[PDB]
Amino acid sequence: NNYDGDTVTFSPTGRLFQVEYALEAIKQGSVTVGLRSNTHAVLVALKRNADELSSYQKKIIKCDEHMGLSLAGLAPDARVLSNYLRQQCNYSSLVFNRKLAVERAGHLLCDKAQKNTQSYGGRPYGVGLLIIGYDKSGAHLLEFQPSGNVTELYGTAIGARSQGAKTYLERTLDTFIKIDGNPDELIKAGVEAISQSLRDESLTVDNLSIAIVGKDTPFTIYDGEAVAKYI
């Protein structure tokens, strides 16, 4: 502790270490991969059980019938952010009679982290979210960091061993963009994408969690004996 244990301070370097600390939430996080093409988005999250008598705790939350977010990091933080996204999503449906703009909602999120990083006794959130959806401008993948950086990407990951996924996506980048109208392939590309990011943790028919959104297919989360078709 010199400048390390306080979110209001600075820092001779000009960082602060409290943000870097929150970025370890990503690091201890479980791998999840999102990739989109141009007609369909897919989030592939690797669920994690505590033990054998136990079930797995879902890692994808239906935010809307065209939007979903998946956590990586702390489970209490994620539950705060998911409620908020939903409130602002229903606000737009009510007030402007309108599906929520994906690009805009990323800035609403940003400012909520920012105000707990301005005032003392606040915290930086320890969850980074991948938020996919399909609106009037097509498929989208937003990447949320603890810092509050919002970026739109063709395909990304966060989690433990995120590097190994990201080198996979650099190969298969030009493949997935060009498959369109066949949601099936993009899912297969996502099963393989997270296989690379395993520590021999395997993929079972209740560990792998697929969720998709289309031109014509609402937000849906597959698990059960649905997933086994892709496994």
């Binding site: 001779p12 990083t117 739109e152 063709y154 650099e170």
Partner: protein
């Protein structure tokens, strides 16, 4: 201890916190503001981190009102709060006085907000430098706002990593044209010194975004330079540095 916060004082006239905020802005990317005869022309160097990105789909120049361009460097999330605040303050003034806000008025407001964040224990002074301007009916103006809440008029301002390359070249441009230059002619100038400001930043690759607010091109609105006009600027600069 007396070197840790903002409400502290130390007998050297230093208030170490605030000076540390400049060090944040010093990690940013180059941003320039070219003050021309007809308006203002901003450009920002936008780092392309990975080939996984979806290109030209992140704007680091955000509009406030319909006539005041705003582009900032330092902490990207932190800056987004400062712009939201100046969009509230613009909207309050637009209602109460039924005109689009003057730029010396927009200056007062923002100026006050960051100054505020050095007088309480429970807040941190924001570490961003803004560059904002446009056309109002008293003419075009440009302001650069330090994280310390310091600002001045400017015929050219910059901030960022490559504020070293950029500044020397802005001297060159007021000695090229000491009677000023056109806002059209200045699109090609913003391309040229953003490209030179990536020789302090050549570990990556980047995308150039250019926007303008000039009276004589855009009817005094804050618009983006886009399509074929934007690629003429890219080519111009690209051939000089080769």
């Amino acid at each position: 201890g007396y070197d840790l916060s903002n409400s502290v004082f130390s007998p050297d006239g230093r208030n170490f916190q605030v000076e540390y905020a400049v060090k944040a802005v010093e990690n940013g990317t180059t941003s320039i503001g070219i003050k021309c005869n007809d308006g203002v022309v901003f450009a920002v160097e936008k780092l392309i981190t990975s080939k996984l990105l979806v290109p030209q789909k992140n704007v680091k120049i955000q509009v406030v009102d319909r006539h005041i361009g705003c582009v900032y460097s330092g902490l990207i999330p932190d800056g987004r709060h400062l712009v939201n605040r100046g969009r509230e303050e613009a909207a309050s003034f637009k209602k109460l006085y039924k005109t689009p806000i003057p730029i010396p008025a927009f200056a007062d407001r923002l100026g006050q907000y960051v100054q505020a964040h050095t007088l309480y224990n429970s807040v941190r002074p924001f570490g961003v430098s803004t560059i904002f301007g446009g056309v109002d009916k008293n003419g075009a103006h440009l302001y650069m706002l330090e994280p310390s809440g310091s600002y001045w008029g400017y015929k050219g301002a910059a901030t960022g990593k490559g504020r070293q390359s950029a500044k020397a070249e802005l001297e060159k441009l007021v000695d090229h044209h000491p009677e000023g230059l056109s806002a059209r002619e200045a699109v090609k100038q913003a391309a040229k010194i953003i490209y030179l400001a990536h020789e302090d930043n050549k570990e990556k690759d980047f995308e150039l975004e250019i926007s303008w607010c000039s009276l004589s091109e855009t009817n005094g609105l804050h618009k983006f330079v886009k399509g074929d006009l934007l690629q003429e600027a890219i080519d111009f600069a690209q051939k000089e540095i080769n």
